[PDB]
C-alpha cells in the first residue's frame, strides 16, 4: 500500500464460486454425516480428523471416498468438476492460460485423467517430480503458449515459483491455512505479471469445504487484527464456525451461509496517566 506507488501492480479480481453438490455426491455426503462414524466423532470415541479427511474427499469427488463413461474419476459426478469443465472450456475458447490448484495430489491425478479425457494440452508438477527437473517444467510453461493448463498443489515447489505466463488461476479446493491459498493466488500474480490475473476459489456450499473457507477467512482476520489494525468489524459465530459435520445445501430460495454472514457488504506524568486510564477504561 505504501510502496505501491514505487512499483507497478496489475489489478487482481477474485470470486468464490459456490458449487452445488451432485445428487450422488450429495447422497454420499449425507450418508457419511448420518453414518455412525460421525456420531462416534461427536462422542469423541474416534478421532475427528478422519471424518474431516473423508468429507473433504467427498466434496472433492465421490470416487475418492467410495473408490464406458464410468471409469475412475468421471467428471460429471461432482459439481466442482462440472464448474471446472465450464471454466476450462470458456478459457480455452478465450485463449488464456490456467493454473489449476488442489491440496490433494490424488484428486490432482483425477483431474489429470479428466484433462486426458479432454483434448487440453497441459503440464503437471507436484511433489513426485524430481526437484532437479522442476525448473525446466516452469520455464517451458512460461516461455511458450502451446501449453494451456499447469497443474499444481498449493504447496509444491519453492516459495513463489515464477509462473507468470498463466493468466487465470483456479483453486479447486480450499485449505486450512490461509497462507497456502494466498500463496497459490500470489504465485500467478507476482512482480512482472503482464495481464490481469483473476482467482476463482471453488466452494461446495453447505458442506465441510465452506467451513474450511470460513476458517481460512477467520485466521486471516486474526492475523490482520494483530498486524495492521485492531479495530475490525466482527464476522462470525462461535458455534456455527466450530461445528462442521452438517449438510445444508442451498436450494437457491435462501442465500448461502457466507453471503448471509457477509450480509452488510521525559513523559510528564499526565500523558503517562492519561494513556494508562485510557487503556484501562477499555
Amino acid at each position: 500500500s505504501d510502496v505501491k506507488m514505487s512499483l507497478s501492480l496489475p489489478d487482481k479480481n477474485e470470486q468464490v464460486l459456490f458449487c452445488r453438490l451432485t445428487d450422488e455426491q450429495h447422497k454420499v455426503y449425507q450418508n457419511f454425516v448420518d453414518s455412525k462414524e460421525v456420531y462416534r466423532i461427536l462422542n469423541g470415541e474416534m478421532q475427528i480428523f478422519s471424518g474431516l479427511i473423508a468429507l473433504r474427499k467427498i466434496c472433492n469427488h465421490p470416487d475418492l471416498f467410495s473408490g464406458e463413461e464410468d471409469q475412475f474419476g468421471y467428471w460429471k459426478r461432482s459439481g466442482k468438476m462440472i464448474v471446472v469443465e465450464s471454466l476450462l472450456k470458456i478459457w480455452h475458447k478465450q485463449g488464456q492460460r490456467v493454473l489449476l490448484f488442489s491440496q490433494s495430489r490424488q484428486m490432482l491425478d483425477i483431474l489429470e485423467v479428466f484433462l486426458r479425457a479432454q483434448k487440453y494440452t497441459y503440464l503437471k508438477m507436484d511433489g513426485t517430480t524430481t526437484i532437479a527437473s522442476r525448473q525446466p517444467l516452469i520455464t517451458r510453461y512460461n516461455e511458450d503458449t502451446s501449453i494451456f493448463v499447469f497443474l499444481l498443489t498449493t504447496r509444491v515447489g519453492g516459495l513463489g515459483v515464477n509462473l507468470t505466463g498463466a493468466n487465470r488461476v483456479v483453486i479447486y479446493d480450499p485449505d486450512w491455512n490461509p497462507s497456502t491459498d494466498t500463496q497459490a493466488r500470489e504465485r500467478a500474480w507476482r512482480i512482472g505479471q503482464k495481464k490481469q490475473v483473476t482467482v476463482y476459489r471453488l466452494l461446495t456450499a453447505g458442506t465441510i469445504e465452506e467451513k474450511i473457507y470460513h476458517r481460512q477467512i477467520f485466521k486471516q482476520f486474526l492475523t490482520n487484527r494483530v498486524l495492521k489494525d485492531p479495530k475490525q468489524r466482527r464476522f462470525f459465530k462461535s458455534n456455527d464456525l466450530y461445528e462442521l459435520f452438517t449438510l445444508t445445501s442451498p436450494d437457491a430460495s435462501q442465500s448461502t451461509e457466507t453471503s448471509a454472514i457477509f450480509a452488510g457488504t521525559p513523559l510528564a506524568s499526565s500523558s503517562l496517566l492519561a494513556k494508562m486510564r485510557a487503556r484501562n477504561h477499555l
Binding site: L267, A268, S269, L272, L273, M276, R279
Partner: protein, 365 residues
C-alpha cells in the same frame, strides 16, 4: 566553620568545598531528632519509605498492614517543633488498597504526580497522586518482593519487578506490556535496582546468592554476574560466581552509579565495580541482616565522602562506602529496621521499622 566561611568568601576554596564538607559534618552528626516527629499512621511495620526525587518535600510509606501513607516533610508551622503530617493515605477503606503488605513504594521520577507500589498481594499498582486512585494494575503470578523505576531514563519507563519467581518482570508503564522477562536467576529475586548512570542497566539480586547486571535492551542474558573472589575460585558457571554466601536481599548503586552495594544474609555488605562487576574488597566488617525479604538501604548524596545507611538489626549502621569504616550506629528503634531513606537536601534520614514507627534522624547543631 569560620575558616570555611572565610575561605568561601575570599575565593581560596571553591564553594563546593563548604557544601560537601558541611554536609559530611552534618551526616556524621546525624542523631535522633526528638525535635521532629512523623505522624504514626501505620498499624503494622513500615516496609518501605520513599522521598520524592524532585523537591524532596513528600514521602510515601508502605506498611505490612497494606496501607500507604503520604507525608509532608516540610515544617509548615512556625515553631521549631513539628510533626510530619500525613497528607493522604491509602487506608483500609480505600477501594484499591493493597490486600497484604506493601513491600515497595516509589515515586515516579521526573514528576510527583504519580507513584507506584507493589505488594504481597501480587500486584504492582500505579497511583495518581492528585486523585489518589489507581491508574493501572499489574498482576503477577507470584508475590512481589521489590520493584524499581529507573531514576534516570528519560526514554523508557519500565518497572523492574522481582517476585518469588526466578524471572525478573519488566512492566512498561508506557503502553502496558508486562510480558518481558529476564531469565537466568534460579530463585526468588529479592531486590531490583536500576543504575542511576545508564538508562538500561538493571541489577537484580536473588536468593540463589547471585547478583546479575542486565541490559534490558540486550537479548542475550545478563551482562555480568557478581563474583566474590573475581576468579580465585573459578568454575564453569553452573553453581559458582555467587555474590554472597546466602540470600542477597539488598541492592543499592552509589550516587554516581559507578559502584554497587549488595547486602546478603551472609551478614556481609560488598561493594562492586558496576562496570565489570569486580569486587573492590572493601571490608565493611559484619553487617547483620537476617531479613527474609528485600532490605531497602540507601547511600548519601552530595557529601565530601559517600556514606551508606544500612539497617543493622534494630539500628541503622552508617559506613563509609569506599573505606568501609563504620561511622556510627543510629539507635532509636525498638524492632528491626526495614528501610531507611536519605533526604539529601538537608542530610536527614528517615527510617521505618517493624515497630510501626518512622523515626527522623536530623543533624545536631
Amino acid at each position: 566553620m569560620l575558616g570555611f566561611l572565610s575561605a568561601r568568601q575570599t575565593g581560596l576554596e571553591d564553594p563546593l568545598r563548604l557544601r560537601r564538607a558541611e554536609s559530611t559534618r552534618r551526616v556524621l552528626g546525624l542523631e535522633l531528632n526528638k525535635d521532629r516527629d512523623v505522624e504514626r499512621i501505620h498499624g503494622g511495620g513500615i516496609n518501605t519509605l520513599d522521598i520524592e526525587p524532585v523537591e524532596g518535600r513528600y514521602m510515601l510509606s508502605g506498611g505490612s498492614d497494606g496501607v500507604i501513607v503520604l507525608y509532608d516533610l516540610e515544617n509548615s508551622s512556625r515553631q521549631s517543633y513539628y510533626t510530619c503530617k500525613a497528607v493522604c493515605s491509602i487506608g483500609r477503606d480505600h477501594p484499591d488498597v493493597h490486600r497484604y503488605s506493601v513491600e515497595t513504594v516509589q515515586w515516579y521520577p521526573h514528576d510527583t504526580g504519580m507513584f507506584t507500589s507493589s505488594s504481597f498481594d501480587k500486584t504492582l499498582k500505579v497511583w495518581d497522586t492528585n486523585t489518589l486512585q489507581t491508574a493501572d494494575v499489574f498482576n503477577f503470578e507470584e508475590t512481589v518482593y521489590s520493584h524499581h523505576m529507573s531514576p534516570v531514563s528519560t526514554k523508557h519507563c519500565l518497572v523492574a519487578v522481582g517476585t518469588r519467581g526466578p524471572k525478573v518482570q519488566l512492566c512498561d508503564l508506557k503502553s502496558g506490556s508486562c510480558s518481558h522477562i529476564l531469565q537466568g536467576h534460579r530463585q526468588e529475586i529479592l531486590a531490583v535496582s536500576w543504575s542511576p548512570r545508564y538508562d538500561y542497566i538493571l541489577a537484580t539480586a536473588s536468593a540463589d546468592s547471585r547478583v546479575k547486571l542486565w541490559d534490558v535492551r540486550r537479548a542475550s542474558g545478563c551482562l555480568i554476574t557478581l563474583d566474590q573472589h573475581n576468579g580465585k575460585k573459578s568454575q564453569a558457571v553452573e553453581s559458582a560466581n555467587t555474590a554472597h554466601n546466602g540470600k542477597v536481599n539488598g541492592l543499592c548503586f552509589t550516587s554516581d552509579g559507578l559502584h554497587l552495594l549488595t547486602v546478603g544474609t551472609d551478614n556481609r555488605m560488598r561493594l562492586w565495580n558496576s562496570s565489570n562487576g569486580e569486587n573492590t574488597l572493601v571490608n565493611y566488617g559484619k553487617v547483620c541482616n537476617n531479613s527474609k525479604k528485600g532490605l531497602k538501604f540507601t547511600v548519601s548524596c552530595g557529601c565530601s565522602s559517600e556514606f551508606v545507611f544500612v539497617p543493622y538489626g534494630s539500628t541503622i549502621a552508617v559506613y563509609t562506602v569506599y573505606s568501609g569504616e563504620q561511622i556510627t550506629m543510629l539507635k532509636g528503634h525498638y524492632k528491626t529496621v526495614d528501610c531507611c531513606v536519605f533526604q539529601s537536601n538537608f542530610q536527614e534520614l528517615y527510617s521505618g521499622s517493624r515497630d510501626c514507627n518512622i523515626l527522623a534522624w536530623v543533624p545536631s547543631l
